[PDB]
């Protein structure tokens, strides 16, 4: 505070560095500033590198170690596993298109079908928030005709998580990778 409207992606990044200067996170403030940034495709084209077969993760800023800010690019029909967020805050702001978010409870030790809690459609410029205390989720671009682009902020940064088998609740550890960093493809 004061929380001012980010004028550009670069301005948003500057404001985020201020909000993450300390050791804690004001979730509502971070969400509000992410929401207030009006997506401008020209500002993030550099990062919007798609793959034909699955969604991509494109690192934008390393947050001076406090957070990772990245752009995810979802082709038509591309989605995630049901997954957690490794004891981190996770903000998801739509830059282009729409994504379906399905929420799930943490499974019990007992093998069982994971039934959805709820679902919603996240629309252009909206910012959602998740953490492990809230639950697990799947995120999907269910469109047949429109790619989706989202802006994700994780604090602290993390590069592993778990994917959950919808049929059993069984989890496995996954290492996350980056498709690009700072606009540069990182095979
Ligand atoms: N957590 C997923 C995206 S859905 O997360 O908000 C990822 O970073 O790949
Ligand atoms: Fe997620």
């Amino acid at each position: 505070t004061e929380l001012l409207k980010p004028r550009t992606l670069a301005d948003l990044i500057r404001i985020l560095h201020e909000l993450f200067a300390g050791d804690e996170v004001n979730v509502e403030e971070v969400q509000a500033v992410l929401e207030a940034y009006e997506s401008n495709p020209a500002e993030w084209a550099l990062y919007a590198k798609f793959d034909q077969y699955r969604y991509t993760r494109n690192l934008v800023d390393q947050g001076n170690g406090k957070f990772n800010l990245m752009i995810l690019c979802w082709g038509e029909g591309h989605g995630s596993s049901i997954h957690d967020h490794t004891d981190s805050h996770c903000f998801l702001k739509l830059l282009q298109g729409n994504l379906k978010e399905t929420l799930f409870d943490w499974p019990d030790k007992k093998s069982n079908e994971m039934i959805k809690k709820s679902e919603r459609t996240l629309r252009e410029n909206q910012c959602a928030y998740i953490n492990d205390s809230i639950g697990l989720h799947r995120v999907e671009n269910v469109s047949h005709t429109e790619p989706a682009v989202s802006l994700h902020l994780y604090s602290p940064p993390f590069d592993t998580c778990h994917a959950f088998d919808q049929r059993t609740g069984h989890k496995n550890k996954v290492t996350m990778t980056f498709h690009s960093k700072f606009g540069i493809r990182t095979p």
Side-chain angles (χ1 to χ4, degrees):
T1 41
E2 79 215 310
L3 301 186
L4 286 179
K5 179 183 164 60
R7 311 157 42 249
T8 66
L9 179 57
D11 198 43
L12 172 63
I13 292 167
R14 190 270 300 169
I15 290 162
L16 294 168
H17 294 331
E18 300 173 1
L19 291 175
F20 287 84
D23 289 336
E24 303 290 312
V25 181
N26 189 314
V27 166
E28 300 79 11
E29 289 185 357
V30 172
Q31 185 171 208
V33 82
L34 284 165
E35 202 147 274
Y37 167 60
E38 288 185 51
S39 178
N40 179 355
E43 291 170 2
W44 50 255
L46 176 64
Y47 309 113
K49 300 180 204 294
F50 285 76
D51 181 87
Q52 179 174 346
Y53 305 109
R54 61 153 286 185
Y55 76 95
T56 63
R57 307 174 87 248
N58 299 282
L59 185 67
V60 174
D61 193 85
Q62 287 180 305
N64 291 119
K66 292 285 184 53
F67 69 79
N68 274 1
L69 186 68
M70 62 188 74
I71 284 173
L72 276 55
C73 300
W74 314 77
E76 299 91 331
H78 289 178
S80 75
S81 65
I82 301 166
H83 62 272
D84 62 0
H85 302 86
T86 310
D87 286 308
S88 290
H89 301 282
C90 187
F91 306 78
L92 187 175
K93 183 213 176 61
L94 268 292
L95 297 177
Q96 176 186 294
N98 299 280
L99 292 168
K100 180 167 72 158
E101 184 192 35
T102 307
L103 298 194
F104 295 85
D105 284 333
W106 284 90
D108 297 325
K109 257 58 286 220
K110 170 175 188 186
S111 184
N112 229 130
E113 166 89 9
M114 309 181 66
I115 303 305
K116 60 206 61 170
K117 297 188 29 163
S118 60
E119 77 172 59
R120 61 175 170 173
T121 300
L122 301 174
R123 306 199 181 271
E124 183 189 82
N125 281 310
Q126 294 194 302
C127 190
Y129 174 76
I130 196 161
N131 68 39
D132 289 346
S133 60
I134 292 171
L136 303 173
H137 75 179
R138 193 194 301 272
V139 177
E140 299 176 271
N141 181 15
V142 302
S143 184
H144 285 261
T145 57
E146 297 296 339
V149 183
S150 52
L151 181 68
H152 296 238
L153 186 160
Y154 300 122
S155 184
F158 64 92
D159 49 27
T160 69
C161 69
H162 303 95
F164 297 79
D165 191 320
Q166 199 175 345
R167 301 282 80 86
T168 64
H170 177 79
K171 84 182 176 286
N172 63 294
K173 195 189 196 178
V174 176
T175 295
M176 312 175 73
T177 58
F178 287 119
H179 190 75
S180 70
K181 300 184 165 177
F182 314 117
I184 305 299
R185 182 76 175 84
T186 52

